[PDB]
Amino acid sequence: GSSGSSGMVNEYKKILLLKGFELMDDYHFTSIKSLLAYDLGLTTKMQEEYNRIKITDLMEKKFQGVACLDKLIELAKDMPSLKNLVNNLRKEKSKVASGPSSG
């Protein structure tokens, strides 16, 4: 064999989908998709054609590193409805950093 176990597939991307678009309502799904359309180059047609996972893959490809998370939070900052996405995303980024909590 070559390896016993591996799971290095951009952990930041996982949180971006699981805790980013998966918990996004239409109220923001249309806003984030519109604002991001200017960057990724999406449109009114692609916005409906593309899927949640599709936009996520584009966010990571266009923004590598923690930037993919900050970008999503920066756009969903002033959103009382997206209090969990911002808290989870921000908290998730901190967990990755060196700092064993609970003790």
| Residue 9, domain extent | 1-103
Structural domain total, the chain = 1
- Position 21, amino acid: F
Q: Which tokens belong to 59?
A: 């966010």
Token pair 């911002």 is found at 86
d(CA 29, CA 52): 9
Token pair 């960057």 is found at 39
CATH number for the domain spanning 79: value is 1.10.533.10
| C-alpha dihedral sign at 16, 18, 21, 27 | negative
Determination method here? Answer: NMR
Q: Are 22 and 52 in contact (CB under 8 A)?
A: yes
